[PDB]
Design a protein around this nucleic acid. Sequence first.
RNA 1: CACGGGAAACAGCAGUGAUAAAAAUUAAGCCAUGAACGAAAGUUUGACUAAGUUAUAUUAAUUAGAGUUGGUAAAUCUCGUGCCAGCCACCGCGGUCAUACGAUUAACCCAAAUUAAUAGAUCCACGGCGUAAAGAGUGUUUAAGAAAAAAAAUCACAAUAGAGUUAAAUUAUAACUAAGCUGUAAAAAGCCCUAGUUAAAAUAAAAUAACCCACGAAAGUGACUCUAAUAAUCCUGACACACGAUAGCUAGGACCCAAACUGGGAUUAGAUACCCCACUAUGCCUAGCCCUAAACCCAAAUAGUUACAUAACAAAACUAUUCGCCAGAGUACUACUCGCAACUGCCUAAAACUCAAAGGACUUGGCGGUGCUUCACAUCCACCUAGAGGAGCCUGUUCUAUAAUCGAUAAACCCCGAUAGACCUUACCAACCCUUGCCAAUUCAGCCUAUAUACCGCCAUCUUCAGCAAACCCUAAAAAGGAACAAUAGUAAGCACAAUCAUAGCACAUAAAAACGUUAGGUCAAGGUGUAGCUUAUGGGUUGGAAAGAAAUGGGCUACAUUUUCUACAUAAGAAUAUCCACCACACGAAAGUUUUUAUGAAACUAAAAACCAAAGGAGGAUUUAGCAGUAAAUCAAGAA
Lengths: 94, 72
Amino acid sequence: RRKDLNRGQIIGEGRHGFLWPGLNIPLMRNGAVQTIAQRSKEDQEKVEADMVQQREEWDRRRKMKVKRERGWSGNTWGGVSLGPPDPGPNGETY
Amino acid sequence: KNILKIRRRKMNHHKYRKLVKRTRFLRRKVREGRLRQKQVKFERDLKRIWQKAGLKEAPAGWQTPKIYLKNQ
RNA sequence: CACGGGAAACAGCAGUGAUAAAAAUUAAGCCAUGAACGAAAGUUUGACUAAGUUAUAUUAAUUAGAGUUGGUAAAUCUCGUGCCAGCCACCGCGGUCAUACGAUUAACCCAAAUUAAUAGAUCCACGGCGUAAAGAGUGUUUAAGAAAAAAAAUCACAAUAGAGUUAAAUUAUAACUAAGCUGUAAAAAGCCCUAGUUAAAAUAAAAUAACCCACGAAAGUGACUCUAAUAAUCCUGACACACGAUAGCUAGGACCCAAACUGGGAUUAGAUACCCCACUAUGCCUAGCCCUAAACCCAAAUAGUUACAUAACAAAACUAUUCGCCAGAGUACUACUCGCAACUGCCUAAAACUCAAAGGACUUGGCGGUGCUUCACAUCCACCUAGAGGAGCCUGUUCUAUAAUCGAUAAACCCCGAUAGACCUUACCAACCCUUGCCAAUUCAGCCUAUAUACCGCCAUCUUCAGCAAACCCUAAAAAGGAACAAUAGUAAGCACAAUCAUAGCACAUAAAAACGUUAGGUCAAGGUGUAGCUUAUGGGUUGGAAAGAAAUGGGCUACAUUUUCUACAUAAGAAUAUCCACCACACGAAAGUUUUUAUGAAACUAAAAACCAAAGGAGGAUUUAGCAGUAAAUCAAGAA
Ligand SMILES: [Mg+2]
Ligand SMILES: [Mg+2]
Ligand SMILES: [Mg+2]
Ligand SMILES: [Mg+2]
Ligand SMILES: [Mg+2]
Ligand SMILES: [Mg+2]
Ligand SMILES: [Mg+2]
Ligand SMILES: [Mg+2]
Ligand SMILES: [Mg+2]
Ligand SMILES: [Mg+2]
Ligand SMILES: [Mg+2]
Ligand SMILES: [Mg+2]
Ligand SMILES: [Mg+2]
Ligand SMILES: [Mg+2]
Ligand SMILES: [Mg+2]
Ligand SMILES: [Mg+2]
Ligand SMILES: [Mg+2]
Ligand SMILES: [Mg+2]
Ligand SMILES: [Mg+2]
Ligand SMILES: [Mg+2]
Ligand SMILES: [Mg+2]
Ligand SMILES: [Mg+2]
Ligand SMILES: [Mg+2]
Ligand SMILES: [Mg+2]
Ligand SMILES: [Mg+2]
Ligand SMILES: [Mg+2]
Ligand SMILES: [Mg+2]
Ligand SMILES: [Mg+2]
Ligand SMILES: [Mg+2]
Ligand SMILES: [Mg+2]
Ligand SMILES: [Mg+2]
Ligand SMILES: [Mg+2]
Ligand SMILES: [Mg+2]
Ligand SMILES: [Mg+2]
Ligand SMILES: [Mg+2]
Ligand SMILES: [Mg+2]
Ligand SMILES: [Mg+2]
Ligand SMILES: [Mg+2]
Ligand SMILES: [Mg+2]
Ligand SMILES: [Mg+2]
Ligand SMILES: [Mg+2]
Ligand SMILES: [Mg+2]
Ligand SMILES: [Mg+2]
Ligand SMILES: [Mg+2]
Ligand SMILES: [Mg+2]
Ligand SMILES: [Mg+2]
Ligand SMILES: [Mg+2]
Ligand SMILES: [Mg+2]
Ligand SMILES: [Mg+2]
Ligand SMILES: [Mg+2]
Ligand SMILES: [Mg+2]
Ligand SMILES: [Mg+2]
Ligand SMILES: [Mg+2]
Ligand SMILES: [Mg+2]
Ligand SMILES: [Mg+2]
Ligand SMILES: [Mg+2]
Ligand SMILES: [Mg+2]
Ligand SMILES: [Mg+2]
Ligand SMILES: [Mg+2]
Ligand SMILES: [Mg+2]
Ligand SMILES: [Mg+2]
Ligand SMILES: [Mg+2]
Ligand SMILES: [Mg+2]
Ligand SMILES: [Mg+2]
Ligand SMILES: [Mg+2]
Ligand SMILES: [Mg+2]
Ligand SMILES: [Mg+2]
Ligand SMILES: [Mg+2]
Ligand SMILES: [Mg+2]
Ligand SMILES: [Mg+2]
Ligand SMILES: [Mg+2]
Ligand SMILES: [Mg+2]
Ligand SMILES: [Mg+2]
Ligand SMILES: [Mg+2]
Ligand SMILES: [Mg+2]
Ligand SMILES: [Mg+2]
Ligand SMILES: [Mg+2]
Ligand SMILES: [Mg+2]
Ligand SMILES: [Mg+2]
Ligand SMILES: [Mg+2]
Ligand SMILES: [Mg+2]
Ligand SMILES: [Mg+2]
Ligand SMILES: [Mg+2]
Ligand SMILES: [Mg+2]
Ligand SMILES: [Mg+2]
Ligand SMILES: [Mg+2]
Ligand SMILES: [Mg+2]
Ligand SMILES: [Mg+2]
Ligand SMILES: [Mg+2]
Ligand SMILES: [Mg+2]
Ligand SMILES: [Mg+2]
Ligand SMILES: [Mg+2]
Ligand SMILES: [Mg+2]
Ligand SMILES: [Mg+2]
């Protein structure tokens, strides 16, 4: 099954931990024009921990995706509710 | 189709006739062999009766003909 | 059955040997009940009473374990294993990525029980019998039953059994006449005591009528005539009775022609067959048997109705009365029985065992040495041209050899990845060497190692083929199908084809394009990747070394010469010309070799050029390739690397 690497990574997000004025951080603070800055060792250990727990969250969310209501027996689709039919062309709704 | 049932029969018959040709004289023995048992059991059947009805000999004028071995 | 005989009896309570998948105390009391006796108190009672043992079943709680987890059927993650070890009640799972095995991890469900086994309860048919298992080969009657009224009219003429008869054809056998006659896809053998003609008995078989549909119970019956003659005031009915095609059997006749068998002849790898030729049992009669058929119209008899109603297909659906028959498939028209003028027979007709099917009808495909139409346009045939297979050489495979790559290898491999290997390339073998070993950082790099049957990429192939496909709509049901243009259920944008583009204006031609799928077709060595493996090595470097030919074959090149060879030369010329003969060899043909140079290059093993030498080859077996016009064929020049 296909996992996407486009999920979870922001722009300017990096392991060498630079805060770029237009991406990681809003362009201005109380004072204008923040400069190019680098977080701590531990601030980075934390953001990395955050991305790790993100991936864990997504894996759990993919595994929790198994739930069903059974129609007759197990994998028999007999008696399974298919859900109300589709509204016709005339606006008729059931 | 139903020929496929007939095929079986056809074969089983053919394979039987062939057999009964090779085995012919073996067969011929065992047939006559049982006819000589038949005629005998038959005889005993009647013998049983004299002895059951109390007579010593078979009744007068009784040769007890051979039916099973009848030929020509 | 116990006089008598074996022989010395727990099938009383406890216990015990042997046997079996099968395991209660050598226990205490007559205290209650029941029993025996007693006049009675009462006495005895392995009956019984109260215990003892056992999860055997229910109940209560103090007790937690077993089985399962692919599907039917509640419930799964990671390893290991690799059609092995194993599992399953049925379908099935294991062949390298197993939710089915073994073991974990979660769950499910039962629970002092849980599974497995074996027996039961339950379980066919008040359903059927054209094609599925099942209407007997035929009729009549007995036994037994069922019952309003109508229910014998005629052959459109071929029941049967007798007796008599013969028109066509054929054959004996003569008379002539000719040498052949017969026979097949083609022949051969065969016969010439043959063939054509003209005569002509027997035997056998019955054109047309029949486009008729009659007669018989069925089998069967259709040349002609005459005799005898077709049951029942009419329901059903057997293992009883009487018949019953062919073939076959017994005895005697018949014998034109046919013909199993058999012998020749072909065909064939073989040909015990299909084709040919003879000839026999046998078809024919009289008498006696045998009693079988796809004895089938696969549709029981007798009265009815066309109401209800389409599994499918076929001959449309059903009442009522009957009899006959059918309980998976084989095994099995079988084994044993019974009976028969049969004695390789007929009839009746099982089980062990094996399997999870076996069957009927249909649906699309695909296929067909089925039939019919229409084509093939380099295309199958007929046709045209030029070649391949023979020779030398070039170059690629395949084999042998090597310490010494890989890939392709029916059409769709074979001058193929290479528009390209002396070192390099290079992946190979032989030795030596190096271990965060390209990078900014990383218990990280790096791997032409195993998977092309995990793949993306690029392609082959059907294919210059016309189809593919969503969205809908219809079909007394739909697996699927879906058109007729005086139109009958089809509409539909999309992708294909077509159209347009390019080949410098048209046109045609060529180029290009050519979906969906097919071949698990090609390629983990273009590159990239999923899964697996390697990590002081399957990684990275240096130095050399490989690519030898017994052959066998694919494709090319050059020839074999006069439509030629040489020189001049561009396309009117001059000479040479395989046999003289001792040429002082020459005619074609040396691309091959030996020698010398030169080009390149650090390195000639490579290319070119001269000098020599002049060999096989004298137009090529079976079989094959290509081309429909500026093409084929011949000739010349350029580029990619
Ligand atoms: Mg389930
Ligand atoms: Mg058989
Ligand atoms: Mg016997
Ligand atoms: Mg006794
Ligand atoms: Mg005694
Ligand atoms: Mg006893
Ligand atoms: Mg006892
Ligand atoms: Mg006793
Ligand atoms: Mg014991
Ligand atoms: Mg017990
Ligand atoms: Mg006692
Ligand atoms: Mg008790
Ligand atoms: Mg219990
Ligand atoms: Mg416990
Ligand atoms: Mg093995
Ligand atoms: Mg595994
Ligand atoms: Mg299971
Ligand atoms: Mg398991
Ligand atoms: Mg229990
Ligand atoms: Mg029932
Ligand atoms: Mg029917
Ligand atoms: Mg049948
Ligand atoms: Mg049966
Ligand atoms: Mg019938
Ligand atoms: Mg009958
Ligand atoms: Mg029969
Ligand atoms: Mg009566
Ligand atoms: Mg009636
Ligand atoms: Mg007669
Ligand atoms: Mg005549
Ligand atoms: Mg004649
Ligand atoms: Mg004649
Ligand atoms: Mg012919
Ligand atoms: Mg001859
Ligand atoms: Mg006719
Ligand atoms: Mg008729
Ligand atoms: Mg009558
Ligand atoms: Mg009757
Ligand atoms: Mg008969
Ligand atoms: Mg006969
Ligand atoms: Mg004869
Ligand atoms: Mg004669
Ligand atoms: Mg003849
Ligand atoms: Mg022969
Ligand atoms: Mg052959
Ligand atoms: Mg033939
Ligand atoms: Mg003859
Ligand atoms: Mg006859
Ligand atoms: Mg018939
Ligand atoms: Mg029939
Ligand atoms: Mg029948
Ligand atoms: Mg009947
Ligand atoms: Mg009748
Ligand atoms: Mg009716
Ligand atoms: Mg249908
Ligand atoms: Mg059976
Ligand atoms: Mg038979
Ligand atoms: Mg039999
Ligand atoms: Mg009988
Ligand atoms: Mg051609
Ligand atoms: Mg063609
Ligand atoms: Mg040639
Ligand atoms: Mg050649
Ligand atoms: Mg190779
Ligand atoms: Mg080799
Ligand atoms: Mg290979
Ligand atoms: Mg391959
Ligand atoms: Mg191929
Ligand atoms: Mg080529
Ligand atoms: Mg090299
Ligand atoms: Mg390597
Ligand atoms: Mg392999
Ligand atoms: Mg492939
Ligand atoms: Mg691919
Ligand atoms: Mg079209
Ligand atoms: Mg359709
Ligand atoms: Mg144009
Ligand atoms: Mg065009
Ligand atoms: Mg093209
Ligand atoms: Mg086009
Ligand atoms: Mg393959
Ligand atoms: Mg292939
Ligand atoms: Mg790779
Ligand atoms: Mg990878
Ligand atoms: Mg190395
Ligand atoms: Mg090297
Ligand atoms: Mg050759
Ligand atoms: Mg040539
Ligand atoms: Mg001249
Ligand atoms: Mg040379
Ligand atoms: Mg020469
Ligand atoms: Mg020569
Ligand atoms: Mg040819
Ligand atoms: Mg270049």
